[model samples]
Target: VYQEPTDPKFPQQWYLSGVTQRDLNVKAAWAQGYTGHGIVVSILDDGIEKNHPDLAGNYDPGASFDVNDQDPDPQPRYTQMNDNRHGTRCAGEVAAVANNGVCGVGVAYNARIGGVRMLDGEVTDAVEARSLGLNPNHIHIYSASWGPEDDGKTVDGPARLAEEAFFRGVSQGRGGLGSIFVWASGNGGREHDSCNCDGYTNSIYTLSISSATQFGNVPWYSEACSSTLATTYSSGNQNEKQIVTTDLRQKCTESHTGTSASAPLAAGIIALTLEANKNLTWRDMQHLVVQTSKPAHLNANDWATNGVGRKVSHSYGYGLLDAGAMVALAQNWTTVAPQRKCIIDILTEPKDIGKRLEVRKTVTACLGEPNHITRLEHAQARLTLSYNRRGDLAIHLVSPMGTRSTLLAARPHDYSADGFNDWAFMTTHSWDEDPSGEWVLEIENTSEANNYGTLTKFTLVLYGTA
Candidate 1:
């Protein structure tokens, strides 16, 4: 049911075409008559060119705001070279107007577009709250590309107010359906930085989107971590072509790159899902993503099957996003069961380390009880540790079903002496697996260099539907 677009550059947008059969499968979704008609996506970035021909037709000022300038309009100031292009490019990927003969068709061309200018100014907890909480009732999706710096040594997440904003969006926004938050995993692979160190992407509330190359390969800039839920197509290197989308100053560009572009494309696909079924809750969107996503390239070593029989990877995640598959499934999807949580406090004992270090603990989940957890959908490990070098450690989680989740891998560049304390690591490796077995957590210091650490406390939380 897919038809090619008449836009001039449509032929060049390999990520939208079925010629390779590895694109987002957006054409099939379009053929099914869901073009994000009722969905609204807000880009939390520098700013967007609202007047651009490709964007103006579907721009929603009600959802647009400028927290940095303390104004209503979210237009980017084009004073600097890199001032306004990022947001515009991301908008084009989401809701650029179709059949206007301007630039190119977006994945969700009929969806409403808006922007919030917060990242370009002084970013404080207050500014973050204002931006993330802006008109959430009207904005169905918030696509954010900016986060803690991609540097390998830094560990940062949302401040206090921002944390409350996320909770607000999920609880009150979209009439309790939850405002979807789409985030970029990061572009720090060259530095050995992992998204596990980035608090925003690791948060259970957000959908962390990574990137795949045009040739169905992992991009050099995309980071790898267990938190990454899915991936989309983006630029690989100088030799590879970048994404084609609208640009700043009323123009179009084919060089929009990075995991930043990947997030909006995912947002657009979700927009189509929303159009198909407005009743989908935030968790339903996540379930749709995990259930419908397909492993992009089988040759990659990062791919593995979890205990739930779902394909997962630290780099590729559940796999590349498929728009057509999602829409088809959403048309008849019944609401998922009610959410439940099982939290277990494992240990608070301290361990001294001078050479190699390893800590092991087991948690059991029993069935047939009023509060016992029988199956798992997501798993998390919260640990407090003290280490001389954080980069020397590797953490692992194993289910009684024998599924392994490498929660944290050694980072060569993370030489920060400040070790992990009260840090939480999330994983989907045990999706759909029975939780009624011994769950194990293992930590090891695999460095020949003089490094030591102490695990003061550990906690495990298993989430599922009973």
Candidate 2:
């Protein structure tokens, strides 16, 4: 058996220090000496084997908990197939010890990583809320990989308690600087699923992260959604290399896959940025992400330039996350102004979509109001609709600057009769765009005759700094 050999595998960490084809360019930040020191990132997964050779040196007990067992030790239940090795793998991605010669170095090699063993038991609203709100002051970043069913049919997000937890976390976490919540955009592209149907990734409180392959190609299992804020490198095709991380049995595995592997890498980058500037608010972190992400490499079909000339796509968001750029920008980054929200009531009466209805609403973007938005950050469309075949429905929101955002794409596998009830569909494609003037909303169905729906309500809510 291969054991205790002090060989380093840092060269295989292509995502960290890539060859320019598809890399995060983290070496720049590393050379600048920001290894995410003094930051705590907690992975809310099954559990983290904190005693692993590569992770023990950086494991933070203060940032960890076991909501499933209602205890302090956040250790995974060892099983036959290593079924609960997820959190440990994610932990290694963020803060595996460096120069220990056991495994590959983490993106934030000097940072501290912890875990919440929440998913091992019955996960209710309260359970999730506790996990999300645990030690918010000590934990600067929360990285979550699981959400509502990614089968492409279920439309769900934070329940009442969990919703309040998110509100509290962003409002009071990290001593009012706001705890950063990095979420994985669901991995269900193989099921023809559109992540727009997922309320968690679409939530404004979370920074949804997507995945591209080592070659900067959209992964086969990645769900496309305009709600995603950025992208990261992860497992791709069978012939390609997957992520390397600490395994469940105190071993190192090079096969961590899916967007589950993408979110922690992003969390590590954010930790490095936090180490550079600890006073950044959650919103500021988001702005830096939008300003620093790169779109030069990812090969997605729907790349389009928004009003502010930022290239964004449903598959890759604002392209891949660059740790070096984000950290560099964070060093001298200015705080964004207070957020303003413009709520425009678009439609009240019911409209039929069987005829392929399209509505255009001219808005002043709440002109002359205290909540008016001149520069846009996030746009949300809260709607209520009833459809015979919900899977056949496709909706688009067009900005005045002619940027078209797909709020919800048709999911062929969705055969539910229960339509959306007051669900919010958000888009980051319009980031930094002007929210003033004419806005167009187009709704269509792919079914020949069986497709029918009632658009009961439509509202436009825009958030940004004046």
Candidate 3:
């Protein structure tokens, strides 16, 4: 009933096949004849080598453009030193035509692949807008591995034009079904950075993906946060092997690593899901991801069951994405209920949340008359605060069903004077929980002596169905 590719490196792709089964379980989906033949996934990164032997067959020039050089072809600017192979490597993971005997097969071997060269040049708002708005009507998914500097102190997000581009893509892309945006949860764990401060990953529009190793261990470079939605396979350390993918100058490499490689693998899985059911909306895809994803390393200490009985963790959100599970659920899946949002404005006076004091705020959802939000899907907390040291504060949010999400954790390297200003933190831990009970927000000034802060104002937003 199933067949494995004869590619030599097929056995090296530990993320897709193994005795211990630490991979995505893609063969099960392939058995059903869903190879993502109709999906288009654009890689938003440095550049992709269109002529790479393994990637040329499925490359689409129409869906690609070079915003960095103002050209039609998004060819990488290869050099003897750098060689700019990030995008090419990521592309090979998604749709590197199978049975060619050049390299390992892709997750969706038949999907069309494109490249957008935006990161190779000066990155500005115009460049980002153009990349995000490129051929949205045709491109079904945008796989991005780049984001703001993850230095544990820099806090940045999309500008106005970029934000508008995201809104447009979700509203008008794929004939209103919404374009899927898959982003890498930043690689800043060594610097003590978290993805919560990265606006691109924290946004509800994008699916933030992390990385796990061949042994089902969290990679050292992959950042952890509540915003991370799911995880995939990548490289670990000197003791472990890296991902094998296409490289620059018509070569195949087995050293592709980092969260950069994790995101496109997820995109490839999503492409398979799209081909299984072309009518799946963006939100429906997200719901399917949460429902079918399996938690990796159940023995890990970070793993916890949320209020809705779903396993979640800062390192691995829902868990490793399973293409087979997703395809099976998507075959007969019905569209979810209409999305409804409930916003609770807590306009309390600015209180001194000084050291040794924990400020607690509570909100109870209403389901009777106007804002009918009974079930929970995703939750966000937007707040403004002023503090002497940003690293001295810790924020915790508890759902009505007793699910706890650590929105902000104290970072030792974060010594920025500017506190969180109108930043939003997102979490998927409360999936399928009832949102009609009391929700609690706890803010603690973790510093024992100095570096106090104040909770200026905050608002809670819950998204679900009635």
TM-score to native of every candidate shown: 0.96, 0.97, 0.97
Clashes by residue pair, model 1: none
In candidate 1, position 172 carries an lDDT of: 88
Q: For model 1, how does the per-residue alpha-carbon lDDT over 78-121 read when each residue is reduced to its tens digit?
A: 87676668988999999889888888989999899999988778
Regions of model 2 farther than 4 Å from truth: 1-7
Q: Which stretches of candidate 1 lie over 4 Å from their true place?
A: 1-3, 353-362, 366-371
- The count of backbone overlaps in candidate 1 is 0
Whole-model lDDT values for every prediction? 0.85, 0.89, 0.86
- Tens-digit lDDT string for candidate 2 (1-466): 2121133767777788756557887777887878989999999999999899999999999989999999999999998988899999999999988878788888898898899999998999999999999999999999999988888777888889999999999999999888899999988998988888877789899999999998779998999988999998999888888898888989988999999999999999999999999999999999999999999978988999998889999998898888889999998988888889899889858899885889899899988889989899999998889989888888999999999999989888899989988888999888888899999999998777567779999999999977
* Candidate 1 lDDT for residue 177: 85
Clashes of each: 0, 0, 0
- What's model 3's overall lDDT? 0.86
Error at 451, model 3, angstroms = 1.8
